[PDB]
């Protein structure tokens, strides 16, 4: 048939048939996804009209579904629903230095840290918000590590509840750029040093009345490192012996050559040079910002969507990747595919979060979280001992044939 | 919102609202950068109107910021400011030999050593200036090391203060050239010696009535060095044994070949020669000069911008790179990005230097330091055992098909 | 866990060295306020870090 | 492990400001200067080799 979206199912006490206005009765096929999952909607001894001659039994009957009829029919509105996070409008970030850009994203209060922290609560974390008031995720404070940013409200003054302080945190990890091909300014290029590696100088002549083809000359330079690792076995601590090894190696190589075409009856001077040293460019370009999200412990007991929520009480850490990826558990949009169908979630019960916070609640907030970040990156580039060189074909000297 | 530039913040005793003419009240967002940093502008028990229902508490309250109102409102002029070092006008250096050029840069008194040494003082160094008078950085004297230049005023005659002599120094390190593509004269090329490596002589003929393609002949020469390094383990000082190795190697290679196209019905003589030995060119070209700056100890106690200025008293060495690079701490322009926003400076408190010397003071002097050096480099080039060779296609002999 | 001939000593070292420390339920410098926990490999001792202060 | 109160010094070129420290001591025969205690103790009193740690 066609998968059902759990929170659209409804139970009616209409005896048998259809319900509401468009709510068709649930079939034996759907029962596969209904199994287990739906039990949260009924009591131990609560049985219910699956339909088509079937009744769902509750926990007291070990969750079995048997033939027969009841008066509590489960029905489903037979209408398509928004099974995805709504249109990610857009985010306009002003141009600036890469880290300056990071700051503006990080500090965009209600449009950034707000809904993020709201999820933390919805998700199942405990101390979400600073020492100021009773609002979820409000008054978070921000600091920075050279390799990331940390959101964590002030830990001073007033403090109550179970465990004083021990606040949860939102950390900004790595990030990347959807370097939009429509724009990219490469700036001036230089080197910052010198070191001669090797050169070659020579020439070729055409002692004929016809133009010739290539006078190929190549200058090449290779580097390599090796990695050996051998284990051997003699007398168990003998004659028969073992030796085994894991490698291996890596190399780099740089060539460069001329393919000059001397004109009839002439001499051509040729030079190739190879150096090594530092290089630098400046950017600048516009791109969509990809954003990594890290959440720290600890969990709110009794309000966790994580499957293992039957027990324990605290430090559950996890990261997400905010962008167009399918890196399993890190993809929030991917996770919606587990709301319906499989028990193979490999993460958390999103249906639980729906019945706790409301579908539209999170539905909206998730868009606030996931929408694209459009920005212009200013700044530059530098690198250590890279390679550099040049090739030239000098002017012809009218003397040969 | 939009980062604030610390030294533009002002406190007014106007109760509540706005200040001056355009000074808007500071928001809760800005408070993140205000935190810690701003404390230097107030006393232990000094509290102040953050605004929007918030008050900043001083050191006596452990630096917390709480809800409420005061009469000391912090405001900000809501106008964009020159958050960078001003236009680097230009510097006209006359053409001369590379080292001759270095001399002119080094000895350009008021336009070079002056503002540099002024920074040394502003920066936080102690004995800045020679034994002559009471002026900062005046009467510095210059000497030279084959690999760099040293600025250091005479150490004789009059001398007082804490520690006699022990002057600070300004050293000129490496430098590089923005070889502007608009000009580059390659001069005459020669070798300074000979040594035959290997040659090959031969020929090819066309015994048909049609022109042929390539008669490829290649002469190749390779060199290589190896690097082995193995550690092994027997009886802990046994049967089971370990061996591990780090590599690796490097090679150089030089080819060269002919791709001659013999005309129908003929004979072509071919020769390829390979030699090794010294080579030389002369330049000459114009370029922008990149300049490395090294400062020696020792620090002026009580007047240091370096974060660790709460204690100790002397030898703090550090280098800068004067040019378009992002090599972290060595980039003065990059450093301005830490004046505002992060506590993650990884260097010195530039805001401290502003409140001590004046913004416009340093603002101007930094340009005097960082402006481009335009110059023409005269001189030449030499190198040891490089490779050299030649290729020739001799005149055709009318005899084949 | 004995701590009387171990921590009440050690904690004085900490304080004497000049480390920031208070005990959840005590105004004393001595490590009276604390208990023993573990990370399997070794052990950790901490003064509650509960209650207001 | 933790933060320095204000004054104090276990192995640092102090005075300092208000940061952490996080280092160890070896209570044993292992003669290793940076964590010896007894060595450190026996040395300062002789030349002032080290700072106020």
Author numbering:
A (entry chain H), B (entry chain N): 1 to 237, 261 to 424
C (entry chain E): 107 to 159
D (entry chain E): 319 to 371
Article passage:
Aerolysin is a major contributor to the pathogenicity of Aeromonas spp, which causes gastroenteritis, deep wound infections and sepsis in humans. It is a pore-forming toxin (PFT), which is secreted by the bacterium as a water-soluble protein, binds receptors on their target cell membrane and, following proteolytic activation, forms circular heptameric oligomers that insert into the plasma membrane thus permeabilizing it, potentially leading to cell death. Combined, these structures, consistent with the recent lysenin pore structure, describe the major steps involved in the pore-formation process by aerolysin: the transition from the monomer to the oligomer with the formation of two highly stable concentric β-barrels, the zipper-like formation of the β-barrel and the final piston-like puncturing of the lipid bilayer.
We next analysed the structure of a second aerolysin mutant (K246C/E258C). While the Y221G mutation, which is positioned just two amino acids downstream of the inner β-barrel (star in Fig. 1e), prevents the prestem loop from moving away from the five-stranded sheet in domain 3, the second mutant leads to a block at later stages, namely, hindering the formation of the full transmembrane β-barrel. Due probably to stochastic difference in kinetics and steric constraints, only one of the heptamers is able to undergo quasipore formation with extension of the inner β-barrel, leaving just enough space for the second heptamer in the dimer to undergo progression to the post-prepore state. The resolution of the obtained EM map is 4.5 Å and locally extends from 3.5 to 4.5 Å. The density corresponding to the prestem loop partially disappears from the pocket between the subunits, as it becomes unstructured and flexible. The transition from the post-prepore to the quasipore state involves two major conformational rearrangements of the protein. First, the inner β-barrel, which will eventually form the transmembrane pore, elongates by incorporating 15 more residues from the prestem loop (c shown in yellow). Second, the protein undergoes a vertical collapse, which translates the extended inner β-barrel and the outer β-barrel 39 Å towards the target membrane.
